[PDB]
Amino acid sequence: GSHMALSLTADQMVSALLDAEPPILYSESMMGLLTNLADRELVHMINWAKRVPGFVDLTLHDQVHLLESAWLEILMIGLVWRSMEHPGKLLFAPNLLLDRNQGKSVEGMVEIFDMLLATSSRFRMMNLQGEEFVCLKSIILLNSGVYTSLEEKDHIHRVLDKITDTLIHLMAKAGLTLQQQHQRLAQLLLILSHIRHMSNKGMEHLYSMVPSYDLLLEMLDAHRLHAP
Amino acid sequence: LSLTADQMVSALLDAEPPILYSEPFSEASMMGLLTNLADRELVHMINWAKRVPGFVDLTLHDQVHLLESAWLEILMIGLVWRSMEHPGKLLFAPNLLLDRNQGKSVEGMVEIFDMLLATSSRFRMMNLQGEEFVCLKSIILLNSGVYKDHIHRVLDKITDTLIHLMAKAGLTLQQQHQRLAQLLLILSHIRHMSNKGMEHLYSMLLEMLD
Ligand SMILES: Cc1cc(F)ccc1-c1c(Cc2ccc(/C=C/C(=O)O)cc2)c2ccc(O)cc2oc1=O
Ligand SMILES: Cc1cc(F)ccc1-c1c(Cc2ccc(/C=C/C(=O)O)cc2)c2ccc(O)cc2oc1=O
């Protein structure tokens, strides 16, 4: 059978997102290594993205739009998640744990590094859970590009409300008061604005030294050819 | 800090800057007109910043950084608010209502226009209220240069304040959290616009604060 996204309970949404997680990939000149990693991560992101409840309900063209706006933020949230148990360090991959100082070997890279580090330490001191993380990553995929067919927008927003509900359930089951539930949610959603900022600074940097709409369309298209 | 939700709102409503006026247009004239308008609003913005509860308690360094980081986001949300009832147009001032065609007269400008219009169309579709608006505007000032325990206390207070307005208007407990989220996710898109806007402006405080 098939569960429509707007029918999911909070626990079924959490279970769907946890089950969709991509694996942690390994690293194979700093930049060449990072690009290869991202490239490989990308193929997996696509598989993940189609398992986000509500995503395949959209037109294909709308799917690519959302993925074109969100892809670098998604890479980044994952990076900051992996880096959480390693203060001062970015875990690009387990064989590629880089610190602030190595970052200074690439011009302008330290600033983004420091932004990424600060986001990671904020997640750490907030004690972000795995179950919250997956909610935030999905929110990113659905939200980044939604402000740039009226039924598609409404549907995307209704799925966003569902993940929000799911985040509130997690916080209520963790014992937070209503005030605390609202404040932590707000705090998590503001971190998302900073992740957007990081992404834009990241993109500026990449264009100055990248998946287009057309490649992501092709990669989305290619997914349908995968052997199950 | 000590204030109630009512007092916070009241304070925010009282601190609101005025709507300024602009002083047929060419490209260079339209941009001079927008520049001079924004220059004039920045003065009032600094003044409004100082009346935001919690802001002057920060160090002057933190006050300058937040404002330097957030000024365009603030200009932009004020614009999107003003333009809300004007489908397909940006109300930069009552005497400077500009349509999508008018923005095509400067290289790169129209892309930002569309993004501003979408934001504005989104606040209309949501029925953004004045009191919610002022809360969001203050969240932007406190959030945009944030990444310190004190900033986050004020933020939590504004969150609480937004929720109380929502409660006051009869929204269920689920509707409240849903709406709060929908609004703070708009803040992501406003940050993005600011970034795009800054990029374009490179393709060309200490006093009022101290
Ligand atoms: C650290 C950094 C600085 C930038 F300034 C731009 C991007 C990054 C960055 C990369 C590096 C990166 C390098 C190249 C590309 C290019 C992709 C492509 O060409 O398809 C993408 C990311 C990254 C790679 C893998 C990953 O899991 C997370 C990451 O998070 C980041 O913030
Ligand atoms: C529409 C736009 C496109 C850009 F690409 C950059 C900024 C804007 C923009 C401006 C125009 C603007 C033009 C010049 C300057 C400053 C120039 C300078 O200091 O030299 C600032 C704003 C603006 C002006 C007043 C206002 O209330 C809101 C506004 O919102 C915007 O998004």
From Swiss-Prot, chain A:
It is linked to Estrogen resistance: A disorder characterized by partial or complete resistance to estrogens, in the presence of elevated estrogen serum levels. Clinical features include absence of the pubertal growth spurt, delayed bone maturation, unfused epiphyses, reduced bone mineral density, osteoporosis, continued growth into adulthood and very tall adult stature. Glucose intolerance, hyperinsulinemia and lipid abnormalities may also be present. Widely expressed. Not expressed in the pituitary gland. The chain holds residues 307 to 552 of 595 of the full protein. GO terms for cellular component: chromatin; cytoplasm; cytosol; euchromatin; Golgi apparatus; membrane; nucleoplasm; nucleus. 17beta-estradiol binds at E41, R82, H205. It comes from the Eukaryota. Changing V52E: Has higher transcriptional activity in the absence of wild type ER. Inhibits transcriptional activity when coexpressed with the wild type receptor. Changing L215A: Abolishes interaction with NCOA1, NCOA2 and NCOA3. Phosphorylated by cyclin A/CDK2 and CK1. Phosphorylation probably enhances transcriptional activity. Self-association induces phosphorylation. Phosphorylated by LMTK3 in vitro. Glycosylated; contains N-acetylglucosamine, probably O-linked. Residues 5-228 are annotated as: Self-association. The modification Phosphotyrosine is found at Y213. Changing R82H: In ESTRR; highly decreased estrogen receptor activity. Keywords: Activator, Cell membrane, Cytoplasm, Disease variant, DNA-binding, Glycoprotein, Golgi apparatus, Lipid-binding, Lipoprotein, Membrane, Metal-binding, Methylation, Nucleus, Osteoporosis, Palmitate, Phosphoprotein, Receptor, Steroid-binding, Transcription, Transcription regulation, Transmembrane, Ubl conjugation, Zinc, Zinc-finger. This is Estrogen receptor. The keyword Lyase does not apply. It is found in: Nucleus; Golgi apparatus; Cell membrane. Belongs to the nuclear hormone receptor family. NR3 subfamily. Residues 9-223 form the NR LBD domain. GO terms for molecular function: 14-3-3 protein binding; ATPase binding; beta-catenin binding; calmodulin binding; chromatin binding; DNA-binding transcription activator activity, RNA polymerase II-specific; DNA-binding transcription factor activity; DNA-binding transcription factor activity, RNA polymerase II-specific. Binds DNA as a homodimer. Can form a heterodimer with ESR2. Interacts with FOXC2, MAP1S, SLC30A9, UBE1C and NCOA3 coactivator. Interacts with PELP1, the interaction is enhanced by 17-beta-estradiol, the interaction increases ESR1 transcriptional activity. Interacts with EP300; the interaction is estrogen-dependent and enhanced by CITED1. Interacts with CITED1; the interaction is estrogen-dependent. Interacts with NCOA5 and NCOA6 coactivators. Interacts with NCOA7; the interaction is a ligand-inducible. Interacts with PHB2, and UBE1C. Interacts with AKAP13. Interacts with CUEDC2. It comes from Homo sapiens (Human). GO terms for biological process: androgen metabolic process; antral ovarian follicle growth; cellular response to estradiol stimulus; cellular response to estrogen stimulus; chromatin remodeling; epithelial cell development; epithelial cell proliferation involved in mammary gland duct elongation; estrogen receptor signaling pathway. Nuclear hormone receptor. The steroid hormones and their receptors are involved in the regulation of eukaryotic gene expression and affect cellular proliferation and differentiation in target tissues. Ligand-dependent nuclear transactivation involves either direct homodimer binding to a palindromic estrogen response element (ERE) sequence or association with other DNA-binding transcription factors, such as AP-1/c-Jun, c-Fos, ATF-2, Sp1 and Sp3, to mediate ERE-independent signaling. Residues 5-228 are annotated as: Interaction with AKAP13. Composed of three domains: a modulating N-terminal domain, a DNA-binding domain and a C-terminal ligand-binding domain. The modulating domain, also known as A/B or AF-1 domain has a ligand-independent transactivation function. The C-terminus contains a ligand-dependent transactivation domain, also known as E/F or AF-2 domain which overlaps with the ligand binding domain. AF-1 and AF-2 activate transcription independently and synergistically and act in a promoter- and cell-specific manner. AF-1 seems to provide the major transactivation function in differentiated cells. Selective estrogen receptor modulators (SERMs), such as tamoxifen, raloxifene, toremifene, lasofoxifene, clomifene, femarelle and ormeloxifene, have tissue selective agonistic and antagonistic effects on the estrogen receptor (ER). They interfere with the ER association with coactivators or corepressors, mainly involving the AF-2 domain. A lipid is attached at C135 (S-palmitoyl cysteine). The gene is ESR1. Residues 9-228 are annotated as: Transactivation AF-2.
